[PDB]
Design a protein around this ligand. Structure first.
Ligand SMILES: CC(=O)Nc1ccc(O)cc1
Ligand SMILES: CC(=O)Nc1ccc(O)cc1
Lengths: 106, 106
């Protein structure tokens, strides 16, 4: 029920959120012109990957899925400048993620 | 039971962790020589404040306490350089926080 909740409640709300768009696919450092991205970011993560993983029964515990969300947001905070819009977008999304996690079943 | 779990399980493990020390008290931008800290960081947070809040029944829901932890970690990622040791310290602590949150009661 935990993973089903993360898929059907948490990911459903985040995926369609207006600020989701920069996070729905992996960062393409070449297309985005970010030559140092993978020098700085050790473990890339995005909602597209998390969504596919939920759909495919990839996770064993809710904790792993939660860690993936955390990694995605943290990468954003670490790589980007504090004043970048994407940082505010991540913050908004992460607050919702945490709120929903707080109501997750045991 | 949620808030009691965050206090007696989550905060107990984080407080005494070896990487806790930079997070046990508010960032003193004057003493640490960080003149731009409060220009960049809008909502300061630390484990000392969270611990006092848990002790004093400040929180209404686990979500608020969780948000405070998140804010503390996010501030760290946003303000500091990616290669700073404190960033790795925050990451380690946040992973533990999330792991414990995953086993929190409803
Ligand atoms: C998730 C993330 O950091 N995305 C991202 C970063 C910089 C940029 O210029 C475009 C997109
Ligand atoms: C929580 C935090 O960012 N602390 C912190 C940042 C920079 C520094 O030089 C010393 C401490």
């Amino acid at each position: 029920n935990q993973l089903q909740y993360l898929h059907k409640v948490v990911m459903k709300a985040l995926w369609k959120h207006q600020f989701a768009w920069p996070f729905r696919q992996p960062v393409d450092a070449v297309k985005l012109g970010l030559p140092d991205y993978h020098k700085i970011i050790k473990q890339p993560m995005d909602m597209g990957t998390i969504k596919r993983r939920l759909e495919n029964n990839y996770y064993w515990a809710a904790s792993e899925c939660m860690q993936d969300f955390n990694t995605m947001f943290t990468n954003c905070y670490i790589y980007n400048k504090p004043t970048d819009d994407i940082v505010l977008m991540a913050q908004t999304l992460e607050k919702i993620f945490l709120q929903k996690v707080a109501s997750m079943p045991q």
